[PDB]
Symmetry: D2
Subunit: 343 residues, 4 copies
């Protein structure tokens, strides 16, 4: 089918499948897997950091980072619509015993003044603000790119207060492709960065956390506690190396396809705003249709297109490697036919 549900559904490339088959492995618990070691070395190098740690998921990447940055009772400033707050099962409270301090943002960009104001003064009644998290290409807002200046401004505030900064860069390469800002530049204004290998980059499993050597050592211990300490994970790391080193540039194609899809959907008559499409996500409202988002998703599935409803009136369409321009053209033919039925 034509899967526009998310970029998480990307499948391994033929190059990845071959590398997994001949991957050199070892027990990572002993630090003896050569491929995992190389993946971490490459990731550290790529983001200009001292060290890196491979994890089974972006969620674990964010959570081990929070654990490594905080102490029980601490508070973590984060954007009110960020993944760490909305889609990580309340893990920060259970695993680290910390409280989130949601700060509103405009498409992922928290006003530097609101962030500075959310920092807790030193008082017996108050938690200690020890971490500030920023999400780049903010998911909930529709894959928007957080301006480099916003990140730089918040980094300055953090520095003045002795507060750590973590960038949830699950889709940081999409941000870099859209903005022209190198990932090293983003990373320089953060103490840690988590980036996904299993979304737009097409690896089957995993993410990576990069940061200072001492922070990574603490995160590695947290990873062991959480259950992310695998054995011969080099099989996964082999695909990860290809994802990191060879699948970044083509993300531009996903952006082009998302924009083309949006422009054409608007032409048909669907409620979409092509001007809001900055990366690989398109938000489709169903207010003008005879059925709501849930009913329209079912009609789409019957015609060969998969998508998710994110509310009763909104559907999200996400492009990726496994959605070609031909697939986009085919999907548009289907959307055209469904508009005749449901407008």
């Amino acid at each position: 089918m034509i899967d526009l549900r998310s970029d998480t559904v990307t499948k391994p490339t033929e190059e990845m499948r071959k590398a997994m088959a001949q991957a050199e492995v070892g027990d990572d618990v002993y630090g003896e897997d050569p491929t995992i070691n190389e993946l971490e070395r490459l990731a550290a190098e790529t983001f200009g950091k001292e060290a890196a740690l491979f994890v089974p998921s972006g969620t674990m990447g964010n959570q081990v980072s929070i654990m490594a940055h905080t102490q029980r009772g601490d508070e973590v400033i984060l954007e009110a619509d960020s993944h760490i707050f909305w889609y990580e099962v309340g893990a920060m409270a259970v695993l680290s015993g910390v409280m989130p301090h949601p700060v509103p943002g405009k498409n992922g960009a928290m006003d530097p003044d609101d962030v500075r104001k959310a920092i807790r003064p030193r008082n017996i009644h108050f938690p200690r603000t020890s971490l500030i998290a920023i999400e780049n290409t903010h998911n909930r807002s529709g894959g928007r790119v957080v301006p480099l200046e916003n990140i730089k401004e918040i980094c300055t505030i953090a520095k003045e207060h002795g507060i750590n900064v973590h960038i949830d860069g699950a889709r940081i390469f999409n941000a870099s492709i859209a903005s022209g800002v190198p990932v090293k530049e983003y990373a320089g204004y953060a103490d840690s960065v988590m980036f996904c290998l299993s979304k737009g980059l097409c690896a089957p499993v995993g993410s990576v956390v990069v940061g200072d050597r001492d922070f990574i050592e603490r995160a590695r211990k947290a990873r062991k506690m959480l259950g992310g300490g695998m054995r011969q994970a080099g099989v996964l790391a082999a695909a990860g190396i290809i994802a990191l080193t060879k699948m970044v540039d083509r993300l531009k194609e996903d952006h082009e396809n998302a924009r083309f899809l949006a422009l054409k959907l608007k032409e048909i008559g669907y409620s979409v705003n092509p001007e809001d499409v900055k990366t690989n996500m398109v938000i489709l409202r169903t207010d003008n249709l005879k059925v709501n988002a849930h009913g329209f998703i079912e009609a789409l599935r019957n015609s060969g297109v998969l998508a998710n409803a994110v509310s009763d009136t909104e559907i999200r369409l996400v492009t990726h490697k496994d959605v070609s321009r031909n697939d986009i053209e085919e999907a548009l033919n289907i959307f055209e036919k469904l508009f005749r039925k449901f407008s």
Copy 2:
């Protein structure tokens, strides 16, 4: 000094000092604690009650008794549980707060409904909604009974518990005319303070169903609130609950007078917003910010707390007489000349 920092500074009345029969509460044998809890449960129309050393403990054992690890707790964005309880909900219960904006403590029921998490693997389970009555941060504002009723209805629909942080619920009752028993009927649990406007030296009480209170009592033991001959404290608590409620009206009168007169001097206050024992004073029209003005106030005989860089909270209580208020106003008058 003229202490306007909080109503927590109230000292025991002579009758409280004399009242302060005991036993070991761990064995449930302190008769005065037992009578205090019996009286509290009766007053709020609940099955059981639990004495605790502080309102923070009262709120926290209630959260522990209402939730499981990983749950989410809907609460007002400027509520005490979120801002002034040291992140205890995350450490003690492993729960995540889900702040919802409110207008003077009143969360729009529709916003509360939208904050409830659907059943999905990525989401915590919303198991509790907390409402703070006479919302501190907004100036000791009274949350409308209709707001609480509506939220209770939503909670019922979804099978979610409701906890009322009633640290100053009697102040609310006195101002609104709504009996505390009526407020409590729309909640599963209520925590109310004995150590603030009611003048007891120590403690608060949590009221609710018998099974919830049993869970809260075990949580209290875990937290370290299981005392021995606490009847010494309970004796003052009974007097606070049974003899000190009516006079809260005097604190409201003094707060309103203070606010009215401060407005006349020229300070940035809103006398029409003052319905209980608190006055929010803004410093945007002064030459110094809240922290600087608090220091000046201290040097002239007046104690108050800054609640932000531009806001000061003034609180009245039994130990601040009308004469004290008049004396404070003379001081505020002099300081307006200096910093305006």
Copy 3:
């Protein structure tokens, strides 16, 4: 009834009642209660430490100490039969996220070599051992006194590893009166000590934690989090000062009464060991009786004597200010009658 269940049942003396009624108080949250401040000053001085913190209970005292000494995932070495492990509702795991590491002891004295062996090596699989707790006048062994030499040897081991030492001194003054070792000497070989005011010292409520200034500041914030931050607690502190300054010497009376009780129980024929009784507790075994401990407790209760069973064959008898020699004599007459019935 004649209460031998625990020394927690002690009621305030007339002196304490007057002091509580006349207590000079203030708001302790602002550090303004003069009586709490004097009690803490006196407590610190008495234990030879720079700071102290009054708490509502010994459990809170131990738990805030654990919170202030550890970080999530740490391990706490403690005696296998200690109160922190058995009677504190699993608080160490919930509040501090730490693991207990039980070590056997002989009457509360953990073999120093066993303690050194229980310290975890630096390995990703292992928690960090950051605290060693020692209980003085170890309850479960029968109110036994831990030798100063034992604490001294453990202190040296702790210093070598950079590990903190906490003494659960709930009944430390009973230990001091029996051994002749000043409480400041026991405390000199520990980082922190918690002692109770509400047991043998007769105060109605509370305990105190003593230690270094930084540690106490962290313990004070932990106390706020747990809910032990009270307002005009000077009412309780007034009785606390009398407990500390005027009720220590008379503990020797409780020790004398416990010894007399044990000797006479042995004379009657009960299975007791007077040679093991050096403080205010007597362990009585029901081995030679036609009933188990629980059934014996019931028989005692029906005859006017209260006590607790500590196992299916052992019951604990505890003396205190509120059980006089006359009461011990009357209890013995009852014990004599019951021995004829169940022996």
Copy 4:
């Protein structure tokens, strides 16, 4: 290269596994759409006679999500005093679940049922609630010892009477089964949940599986999401797991035969080992009759081409697995014989 007797975790994928992983049919497991993971879980559930199963990236995660699903904050978990959950899982039970471990000493990994019974907390405000009893099968620390089915049966009876959950840390449960002749479904029949590893003796590169009732597995799956074990196209890993379960269990007998040979021969040389205690893939060697300690002996073995781990200042653990052949065992033995001349 060196003879690695450090652990069975070092097993490398077989040629068949490598091909199945690279060519695995995958999908997004978060949506429950990876066909290979789904088949691995179906097969695992069936093998253990349970309704459901959950793939996890490690045995530690398997145990921890099970503890999370079986307990509430403040609960106590009875477990053997030398078990992996207590010693080698980074204190995770306290941090993740807020539960207290209640160690019960065991005899060769087996806790006496009456000691388990006595460890259950009475209902009292001072005591945590005992909600889970964990049993480790082929108990590692004692030397890969096999816990009898009757021990597990008796504990199950006690747990049922008290309404307590039972979890089997079956990291090496197939080793127990091969040695005892007891099908794994029989061990599992006396437990609410069982975690078993695919990445040790079964030779898969990554992961373990938890089996149990549908509702428990659903709760464990949500715990897995929270801990970060919710992967995407994990079918790549599951492909090797299916082969581990279907083709690598019977040969564990070879690992046991190799360990028995190793022990018998080490005894003949003069080392302090007990061949009579060796029934699975582990041999405990004490250094009591050597003029060196445990760590020093490990260093000497390393210098001679043999890798092992010290588990005490006087104990070393030798583990056999697919990647150590009988010829490798003979080589190690010949070296052990000589190093016996140097250190005795």
